[PDB]
Design an enzyme around this catalytic site. Structure first.
Site, PDB file in Angstrom:
ATOM      1  CB  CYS B 110      -6.301  -0.421  -6.360  1.00  0.00           C
ATOM      2  SG  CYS B 110      -7.676  -1.252  -5.534  1.00  0.00           S
ATOM      3  CG  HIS B 145      -4.946  -4.985  -6.456  1.00  0.00           C
ATOM      4  ND1 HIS B 145      -4.945  -3.616  -6.294  1.00  0.00           N
ATOM      5  CD2 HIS B 145      -3.825  -5.283  -7.154  1.00  0.00           C
ATOM      6  CE1 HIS B 145      -3.877  -3.107  -6.883  1.00  0.00           C
ATOM      7  NE2 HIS B 145      -3.178  -4.097  -7.405  1.00  0.00           N
ATOM      8  CB  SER B 162      -0.632  -1.904  -5.212  1.00  0.00           C
ATOM      9  OG  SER B 162      -0.503  -2.874  -4.195  1.00  0.00           O
TER      10      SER B 162
END
Lengths: 5, 246, 36
Positions: B110, B145, B162
């Site tokens: 990510c 994330h 992702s």
């Protein structure tokens, strides 16, 4: 970040 | 959660560590690793063309081409991140790494995707870019994330990478930042994740100063503690501040 | 020189993508098992 989710 | 700090080709320590991790993680372990390492007839993976904006392209088709490029690099499930990203490094340095990603053409996760999406949208002033970071909680552990928020022609969207298809790219159809953030939160809840923190960065400059880094946490909301009306209130205020260049 | 190094990069990349496919399939199975 590592886990991404 | 290993990171390659050795450049390319990857050095022995980093390379052997990668193989030992996946041998532990995979249930066929040693048999799987032995099937790949020193295999004599491995396909040479094709190298995807780096996307480049041309005037003949709509902005959505261009963004989709960027996102497809990232998908073709693939999400990195090996356990070894191949490109080191120091999040506080100046953008000038991060963009050298992004170029290295297009040259070495390996899977990414990510954070690398956010850097790469900045690199590939640099120079189209119609697209404003800003990082969106999530801290989530799932079955007793915290997860981090990040994606690349996009604002263009009065609409919000995102680019990213992702493990989950609903936590990365989002089309330019969200009329507010809140709607975009709430779509990520709803997507996360499909995986039984509770969002603990949302961090919004500043717009990433298309022509940054020599030492300017990405700013990752201009707004930090502890969303698990807030009612959704207050979350929307705070995101909309911040988004208005962004759009006015305050 | 830098020649043998480029050969290593290409072999490492072929193995990385072979491995990433296998690991991606694993994560896909586990995700399918949890979602059931």
């Amino acid at each position: 970040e590592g886990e991404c989710y | 959660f290993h990171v390659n700090k050795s450049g390319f080709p990857i050095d022995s320590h980093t390379w052997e560590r990668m193989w030992m991790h996946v041998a532990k993680v995979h249930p066929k372990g040693g048999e799987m690793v032995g099937a790949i390492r020193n295999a004599a007839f491995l396909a040479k993976p094709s190298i995807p063309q780096v996307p480049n904006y041309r005037l003949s392209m709509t902005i959505p088709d261009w963004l989709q081409a960027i996102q497809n490029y990232m998908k073709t690099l693939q999400y990195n499930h090996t356990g070894t991140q191949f490109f080191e990203i120091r999040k506080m490094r100046p953008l000038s340095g991060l963009m050298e790494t992004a170029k290295e990603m297009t040259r070495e053409s390996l899977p990414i996760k990510c954070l690398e995707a956010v850097i790469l999406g900045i690199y590939l949208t640099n120079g189209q002033p119609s697209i404003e870019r800003f990082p969106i970071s999530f801290k989530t909680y799932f079955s007793g552990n915290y997860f981090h994330h990040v994606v690349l928020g996009i604002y263009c022609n009065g609409r919000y969207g995102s680019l990213g990478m992702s493990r989950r298809a609903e936590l990365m790219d989002k089309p330019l159809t969200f009329r507010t930042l809140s709607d975009l953030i709430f779509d990520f939160e709803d997507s996360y809840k499909k995986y039984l994740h509770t969002v603990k923190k949302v961090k919004i960065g500043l717009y990433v400059p298309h022509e940054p100063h020599s030492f300017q880094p990405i700013e990752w946490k201009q707004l930090v909301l502890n969303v698990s503690k807030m009612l959704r009306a207050d979350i929307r209130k705070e995101l909309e205020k911040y988004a208005r501040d962004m759009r006015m260049k305050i | 020189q830098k020649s043998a190094q480029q050969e290593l990069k290409q072999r490492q990349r072929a193995e990385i993508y072979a491995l990433n496919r296998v690991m991606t399939e694993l994560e896909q199975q586990q995700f399918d098992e949890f979602s059931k």
